[PDB]
Structure 1
Amino acid sequence: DRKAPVRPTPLDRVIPAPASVDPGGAPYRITRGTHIRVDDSREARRVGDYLADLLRPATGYRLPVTAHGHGGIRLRLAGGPYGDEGYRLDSGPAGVTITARKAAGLFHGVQTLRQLLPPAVEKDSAQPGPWLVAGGTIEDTPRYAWRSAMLDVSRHFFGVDEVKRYIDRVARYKYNKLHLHLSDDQGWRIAIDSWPRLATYGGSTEVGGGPGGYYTKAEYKEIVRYAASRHLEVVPEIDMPGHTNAALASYAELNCDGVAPPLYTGTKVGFSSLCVDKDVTYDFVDDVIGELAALTPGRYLHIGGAEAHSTPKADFVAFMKRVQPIVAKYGKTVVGWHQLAGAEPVEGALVQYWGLDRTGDAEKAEVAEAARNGTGLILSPADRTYLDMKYTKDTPLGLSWAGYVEVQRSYDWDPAGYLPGAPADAVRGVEAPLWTETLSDPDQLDYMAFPRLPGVAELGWSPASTHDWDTYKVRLAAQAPYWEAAGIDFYRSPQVPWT
C-alpha cells in the first residue's frame, strides 16, 4: 500500500524535521465537501488558493476558498511565537488549522501538510485517497533565516517555465531564497538596455554550443513574481571580475587588449577577467548593477567574486574595493563568494563559503575572521551541498573535482560548528547550489538535486537537536512514493532505505 497507505504517515515524518511534534488523537480526513477557510485578506486567499490548487487534481474535490464558515481546513493569521516564517498546525476530527503571524508561515504550514497527506496527493487525476492527516499538534520555526537554492542558468539556459518548475521543487522544503546565477563564461542571461549585445550576443549560446537564451526584463520580473508567490526572495548574481567571458565576448572594449574573445562553450573555469585597469570597466559594472537592482525587490545583490584566476591578487582587491560601493549606491546588500573575505567586505555584506573539509587553514581563517568582523556567512561547502557533484564514481552526470558526495555526507554536519573559529552567530544559513555544466534538461536537474535537496533545507530549518542521520534517512526514504507519483526523478542512494 505504498501509493495509498491504510493509515496516515506519522505526524513527525516530514522534512525539514519540525521544531516540535506532539502526536495525539484521531486524524483529520479531507472529504469531498471540505472548504478551505481563510481570513478576509488578499494574502490569506492567496495561500488558500495555492493549497486548493495543490489538492484539487488528486482529490478531484472542489475545495472552495472562502472567508466565511467553519472550513475543515483553516488558515489563520494571529499572534503567536512563530515569527515571520513559523506556524502551528493542529489536526484532528474537527479539522486542520494552520496558524501563523504572516502569510509565509501559513505557506510553510502548507508544505508540511502536503507531506502529512499520502503520496497519491501528487497525482494529476482523482484518486481514492484516503486523504488522512495524522492527529496532533506541530509548532515550527526556522533555525536560520538564509535557506537558499541556486540555479545556474548560464552553463545551460533554462527558460521561465523551467525555472518555475525548479522553484516549485524547492518550495516543498521551505527554502526562502532563490539564488540565480545569471552570468558566466558560457552565457549572459539578463537583458541590459545600456549594453544590448550582452543578451543578444552574450546569451546566444551555452555549454556544448547551439542556442542559448536569456530573460527579457519582463521575463525576469515574472520569475521574481512567481518566486515571491512561493515565498522565495530572488538573489540575482552577476559574477565579477572573473567568469565574465560572455560579457567580454560581447564588447571588445571591455577586454584588456581591446579584442573580444570568442563565445565560450567549454566547461573550464578561471580564465576570464574584466580589465581592472580600464575606466570603461566600472561604467559597465555600474550600468549593469543599476539595471539589475531596479528589477530586484529583494534586499541582496550577488557580485560573485570567485575564481578570478586571471585577475592578480592586488587587482582583485582594488576591483572589489571599487565595485562593492556600487551595490549600496543602488540600495542593496552585497553578497559574494568567500573570496571576497580577502578583499575587505563592506559593512553589511555576506559571503558565501564554498570551501571543503580539505581546504587549507589559511583560507578557512580568512573567512572566520570576516565572520568576526561582522560579515554574514552563507554555508555551501563544495563537498557537501554542491548538487552538481557526483554521488559516486559511477554517477552519469555531474562533476567530481570536490570528491564524491553521497546523501549522508551532504546531510551529516552542523552549520553552527562547521567553520573552525567562526562565531556561530555569524552563520546566516545555508545554500544548495546546482551548477549546470553537465545538465541540459529539467529531468537531469531533478536527478542531481534529489535526494540531497531536502537535506540542505533541513540544515537550514530544523533545530540542531533534531539532527540525526539514522532517523533522518527514514524520513527521506518516505519521500520515494511521493517523488515517483509526482514524476520527480531522483538518485536511489543505497544509503537510504527507500519506501
Structure 2
Amino acid sequence: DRKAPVRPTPLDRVIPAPASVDPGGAPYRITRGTHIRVDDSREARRVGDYLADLLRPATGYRLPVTAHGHGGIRLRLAGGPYGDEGYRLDSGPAGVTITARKAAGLFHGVQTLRQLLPPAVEKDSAQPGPWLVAGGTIEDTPRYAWRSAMLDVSRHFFGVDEVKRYIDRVARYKYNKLHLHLSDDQGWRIAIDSWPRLATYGGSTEVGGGPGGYYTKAEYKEIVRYAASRHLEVVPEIDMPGHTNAALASYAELNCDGVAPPLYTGTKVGFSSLCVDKDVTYDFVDDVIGELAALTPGRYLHIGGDEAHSTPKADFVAFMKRVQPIVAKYGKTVVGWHQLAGAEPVEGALVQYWGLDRTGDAEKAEVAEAARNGTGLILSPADRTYLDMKYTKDTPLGLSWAGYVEVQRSYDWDPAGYLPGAPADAVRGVEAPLWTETLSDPDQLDYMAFPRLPGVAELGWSPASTHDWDTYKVRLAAQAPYWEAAGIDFYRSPQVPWT
C-alpha cells in the first residue's frame, strides 16, 4: 500500500525535521466538501489558492477558498512565537489549522501538510485517498535565515518554464532563496539594454554548442514574480572578474588585447578575466549591476569572484575594491564566493564558502577571519552540497573533482561547527548549488538534485538537536513513493532504505 497507505504517515515524518512535533489523538480527513478558510486578505487567499491547486488534481475535490465559515482546513495569520517564517499546524477530527504571523509561515505550513498527506496526493487524476493527516500539533521555526538553492543556467540554458519547475522542486523543502547563476564562460543569460550583444551574442550558445538562450527583462521579472509567489527571494549572480568569456566574446573592447575571444562551449574554468587595467571595464560593470539591481526586488546581488585564475592576486584585490561599492550604490547587499574574503569584503557583505574538507588551513582561516570581521557566511562545501557532484564513480552525470558525495556525506555535518575558528553566529545559512556543465534537461537536473536537495534544506531549517543520519534516512526513504508519483527522478542511493 505504498501509494495509498492504510494509515497516515507519522506526524514527525517530514523534511525538514520540524522543531517540535507533538502527535496525539485521531487524524483529520479531507473529504469532498472540505473548504479552505483563509483571512480576508490578498496574501491569505494567495496561500489558500496555492494549497487548493496542489490538492485538486489528486483529490478531485472543489476545495473552495473563502474568508467565511469554519473550513476544515484553516490558514490564519495571528500573533505567536513563529517569526517571519514559522508556523503551527494543528490536526484532528475537527480539522487542520495552520497558524503563522506571515504568509511565508502559512506557505511553509503547507509544505509540511503535503508531506503528511499520502503519496497519491502527487497524482494528476482523482485518487481514492484516504486523505489523512496525522493528529497532533507541530510548532516549527527555521534555524537559519539563508536557505538557498542555486541553478546554473549559463552552462546549459533553461527557459522560464524549466526554471519555474525547478522552483517548485525546491519550494517543497522550505528553501527561501533562489540563487541564479546568470553568466559564465559559456553564456550570458540576462538582457542588458546598455550592452545589447551580451544577450544576443553572448547568449547565442552553451556547453556543447548549438542554441543557447537568455531571459528578456520581462521573462526575468516573471521568474522573480513566480519565485516570490513560492516565497523564494531571487539572488542574481553576474560572475566577475572571472568566468566572463560570454561578455568578453561579445565586446572586443573589454579584452586586454582588444580582441574578442571565441564563444566558449567547453567545460573547463579559470581562463577568462575582465581587463582590470581598462576603464571601460568599470563602465561595463556599473551598467550591468545597475540594470540588474533594477530588476531585483530582493536585498542581495551576487558578484561571484570565483576562479579568477587569469587575474593576478593584486589585480583581483584592486578589481573587488572598485566594484563592491557599485552594489551599495544601487541599493543592494553584496554577496560573493569566498575568494572575496581575500579582497576586503565591504561592510554588510556575505561570502559563499565552497571549500572542502581538504582545503588548506590558510584558505579556511582567511574565511574565518572575514566572519570574525562581520562578514556573513553562506556554507555550500563542494564536497557536500554541490549537487552536480557524482554520488559514486559510476554516476552517469555530474563531476568528480571534489571527490564523490553520497547522500550521507551531503547531510551528515553541522553548519555551526563546520569551519574551524569561524564564529557560529557568523553563519547565515546554507546553499545547494546545481552546476550544469553536464546537465541539459529538467530530468537530469532532478536526478542530480534528488535525493540530496531535501537534506541541505534540513541543515538550513531544522534544529541541531534533530540532526541524525540513522533517523533522517528513514524520513528520506519515505519520499520515494511521493517522487515516483510526481514523476521526479532521483538516485536510489544504497545508503537509504527506500519505501
Deviations 1:325-358 (A, max 9, x none): 0000000000000000000000000000000000
Alignment partners' CA distance in 2, 1:408 and 1:303: 31
1:364 deviates by 0.1
Equivalent position of 1:312 in the other structure? 312
Alignment partners' CA distance in 1, 2:217 and 2:323: 23
1:362 deviates by 0.1
Alignment partners' CA distance in 2, 1:386 and 1:3: 31
Equivalent position of 1:366 in the other structure? 366
Equivalent position of 1:442 in the other structure? 442
SS at match of 2:128: coil
Alignment partners' CA distance in 2, 1:83 and 1:71: 25
1:251 deviates by 0.1
SS at match of 1:188: coil
1:24 deviates by 0.0
Equivalent position of 2:7 in the other structure? 7
1:288 deviates by 0.1
Deviations 1:384-421 (A, max 9, x none): 00000000000000000000000000000000000000
Equivalent position of 2:297 in the other structure? 297
SS at match of 1:51: helix
Alignment partners' CA distance in 1, 2:59 and 2:88: 24
Equivalent position of 2:198 in the other structure? 198
Deviations 1:403-462 (A, max 9, x none): 000000000000000000000000000000000000000000000000000000000000
Alignment partners' CA distance in 2, 1:371 and 1:44: 38
1:361 deviates by 0.1
1:168 deviates by 0.1
Equivalent position of 1:237 in the other structure? 237
SS at match of 2:76: strand
Alignment partners' CA distance in 2, 1:319 and 1:198: 21
1:266 deviates by 0.1
SS at match of 2:215: coil
Alignment partners' CA distance in 2, 1:323 and 1:217: 23
SS at match of 1:370: helix
Alignment partners' CA distance in 1, 2:107 and 2:307: 37
SS at match of 2:264: coil
Alignment partners' CA distance in 2, 1:373 and 1:205: 41
Unaligned runs of 5+ in 2: none
SS at match of 1:163: helix
1:157 deviates by 0.0
Alignment partners' CA distance in 1, 2:473 and 2:194: 50
SS at match of 2:150: strand
Deviations 1:277-321 (A, max 9, x none): 000000000000000000000000000000000000000000000
1:191 deviates by 0.1
Alignment partners' CA distance in 2, 1:74 and 1:153: 38
Q: Does 1:217 align with 2:217?
A: yes
Alignment partners' CA distance in 1, 2:331 and 2:82: 29
SS at match of 2:377: strand
SS at match of 2:155: coil
1:162 deviates by 0.1
Alignment partners' CA distance in 2, 1:218 and 1:376: 32
Deviations 1:232-271 (A, max 9, x none): 0000000000000000000000000000000000000000
1:202 deviates by 0.1
1:76 deviates by 0.0
Alignment partners' CA distance in 2, 1:247 and 1:54: 41
Equivalent position of 2:249 in the other structure? 249
* Count of matched residue pairs: 499
SS at match of 2:83: coil
Alignment partners' CA distance in 1, 2:306 and 2:434: 16
Alignment partners' CA distance in 1, 2:137 and 2:130: 20
1:72 deviates by 0.1
Alignment partners' CA distance in 1, 2:217 and 2:269: 28
Alignment partners' CA distance in 2, 1:306 and 1:372: 21
Alignment partners' CA distance in 2, 1:362 and 1:315: 20
Deviations 1:165-200 (A, max 9, x none): 000000000000000000000000000000000000
Note the 1:11-90 alignment, pairs <5 A: 11-90=11-90
1:45 deviates by 0.1
SS at match of 2:204: coil
SS at match of 1:98: strand
Equivalent position of 2:475 in the other structure? 475
SS at match of 1:334: strand
Alignment partners' CA distance in 2, 1:63 and 1:454: 28
Alignment partners' CA distance in 2, 1:184 and 1:299: 22
TM-score normalised to structure 2 length? 1.00
Note the 1:153-164 alignment, pairs <5 A: 153-164=153-164
SS at match of 2:125: coil
Deviations 1:78-118 (A, max 9, x none): 00000000000000000000000000000000000000000
1:12 deviates by 0.1
Alignment partners' CA distance in 2, 1:9 and 1:311: 54
Alignment partners' CA distance in 1, 2:364 and 2:4: 49
Alignment partners' CA distance in 1, 2:313 and 2:19: 45
TM-score normalised to structure 1 length? 1.00
SS at match of 2:268: coil
1:273 deviates by 0.1
Alignment partners' CA distance in 1, 2:253 and 2:117: 58
Alignment partners' CA distance in 2, 1:19 and 1:217: 40
1:478 deviates by 0.1
Alignment partners' CA distance in 2, 1:295 and 1:191: 11
Equivalent position of 2:176 in the other structure? 176
Alignment partners' CA distance in 1, 2:180 and 2:171: 15
Alignment partners' CA distance in 2, 1:401 and 1:312: 23
SS at match of 1:187: coil
